[PDB]
Design a protein around this ligand. Structure first.
Ligand SMILES: O=C(Nc1nc2ccccc2[nH]1)c1c[nH]nc1-c1ccc(F)cc1
Ligand SMILES: Cc1nn(C)cc1C(=O)Nc1nc2ccccc2[nH]1
Length: 215
């Protein structure tokens, strides 16, 4: 692996989104990861549908919480692999209300065929990420409300409560760090993003890393 990676600069990452008040940090992580994989497959970067998962993924509990791997498993095994575009199934649960499931011909933004889990190794994840693109990970965002910007180093690492998207790292800097895409708009943190120290398992980042697999 290289000294640094940033998939935004390779134009492979969609704009930062806003989950509003809904525990759907997963849907955003899982989907965010798929948006990138679809692009890196050779296709146009399409903004995909988080609402699809909140409403339809029954394995996951909609708004009160979910898990990225269940999404990938659900999409492939219950939804025939289909991920809808956002224009055809837009986010509604911003305020907490999650509509019912639908099928009046939504548009399929991407078709995935599986997913893979990565080891609990920050270095190995970086190895995969550098080659294959943004990785979906779970973290302990207890210490994230207070976040203004900078390389975070004293992150509470006890409870996985939040789902996000790794878009690259930087092993060259004074303090090596992961670059993480977050679903709390762009006012939060560094234009929507956040940098946590790479190597010491900040925020329990290496604990639940996975990525969808296209084609
Ligand atoms: O509730 C969430 N996750 C969760 N915990 C569970 C315990 C028992 C059964 C199902 C469960 N699902 C959740 C809400 N917002 N974000 C996440 C999230 C937390 C961890 C994670 F890895 C991914 C998402
Ligand atoms: C959503 C959600 N569900 N639960 C249980 C907590 C949250 C949450 O913290 N949202 C949130 N915090 C923010 C802090 C700063 C800016 C924007 C912010 N948005």
């Amino acid at each position: 692996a290289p000294a640094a990676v940033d998939w935004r600069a390779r134009g492979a990452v969609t704009a930062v989104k806003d989950q509003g008040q809904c525990g759907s940090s997963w849907a955003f992580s899982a989907i965010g990861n798929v948006e990138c994989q679809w692009f890196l497959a050779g296709h146009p970067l399409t903004n995909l549908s988080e609402q699809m998962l909140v409403s339809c993924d029954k394995t996951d509990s909609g708004c009160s919480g979910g898990l990225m791997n269940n999404a990938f498993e659900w999409i492939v095994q219950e939804n025939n692999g289909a991920v809808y575009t956002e224009d055809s199934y837009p986010y509604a649960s911003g305020e907490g209300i999650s509509p019912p499931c639908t099928t009046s011909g939504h548009t399929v933004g991407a078709t995935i065929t599986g997913h893979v889990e990565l080891p609990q190794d920050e270095a190995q994840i970086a190895a995969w990420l550098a080659v294959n693109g943004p990785v979906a990970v779970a973290v302990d965002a207890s210490s994230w409300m207070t976040y203004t910007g900078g390389v975070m180093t004293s992150c509470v690492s006890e409870q996985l409560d939040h789902g996000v998207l790794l878009v690259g790292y930087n092993d060259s800097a004074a303090v090596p760090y992961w670059i993480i895409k977050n679903s709390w708009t762009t006012q939060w943190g560094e234009e929507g993003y956040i940098r946590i120290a790479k190597g010491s398992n900040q925020c329990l980042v290496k604990e639940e890393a996975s990525s969808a697999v296209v084609g």
